[PDB]
DNA sequence: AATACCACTGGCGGTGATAT
DNA sequence: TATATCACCGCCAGTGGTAT
């Protein structure tokens, strides 16, 4: 698969690190998160591990489950989500 | 590969509301489907497919087109506007 | 367990030409 | 023209099976 960009790989590392810090307090695993995003565990592993790119919807759903802001792992997707909101206001 | 899914009733109605706005506003704003395609970085058949309900709007596209046509997304697509506000709830 | 690896495919979001 | 509607398909996110 084409490598993702270094910024995209950094967002995936910040995202997975939050999951490792919060997984026991929030009672999570890759398969339960898979279920909440209606996806499979290997679909989640690919996002956590910088194999498949994060998009604005997946990131927004993961930020909600993990109780963090999107900007905590992806400043650029958070930038994007804010631009689109300028169009609904 | 070949596959394309048919749009839903809702996606067709959004498309139909977006083309209407464009027709109501194109020369007051000085727009054609190829100026718009250029604005959006694609060709006139790309825009053609969106206005004519062949390809479905996504949130990024719907937000660029809203800004350019100076409407809010909800004027042609409440469900994408609701989807965009649900994403915003995660950055605020 | 819980997660990672790997080959694979559906459909997203287009393209250019041509017909109207 | 300006638009609509062909035929066409690259690409990669997500899969599901299996291994660690």
From Swiss-Prot, chain B:
Residues 29-48 bind DNA. Residues 18-76 form the HTH cro/C1-type domain. Disulfide bonds: none annotated. Acts as a transcriptional repressor that allows virus to establish and maintain latency. Prevents both the viral DNA replication and the exit programs. Clamps the two operator OL (operator left made of OL1, OL2 and OL3 sites) and OR (operator right made of OR1, OR2 and OR3 sites) together by binding to them and arranging the intervening DNA in a loop. This step allows repression of lytic pR and pL promoters by binding to OL1, OL2, OR1 and OR2 simultaneously. Homooctamer. The DNA loop is maintained by octamers of repressor cI. Bacterial cells harboring a lysogenic lambda phage are immune to further infection by lambda. The cI repressor protein inhibits the lytic development of any additional infecting phage particles. The region of the genome that codes for the cI repressor protein is known as the immunity region. This is Repressor protein cI. It comes from Escherichia phage lambda. The lineage of its organism: Viruses, Duplodnaviria, Heunggongvirae, Uroviricota, Caudoviricetes. The gene is cI.
């Amino acid at each position: 698969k084409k490598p993702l960009t270094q910024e995209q790989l950094e967002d995936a590392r910040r995202l997975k690190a939050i999951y490792e810090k919060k997984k026991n307090e929030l009672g999570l695993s890759q398969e339960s998160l898979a279920d909440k995003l209606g996806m499979g565990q290997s679909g989640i592993g690919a996002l956590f591990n910088g194999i498949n790119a994060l998009n604005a919807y997946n990131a927004a759903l993961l930020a909600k489950i993990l109780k963090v802001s999107v900007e905590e792992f992806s400043p650029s997707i958070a930038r994007e989500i804010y631009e689109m909101y300028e169009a609904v206001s």
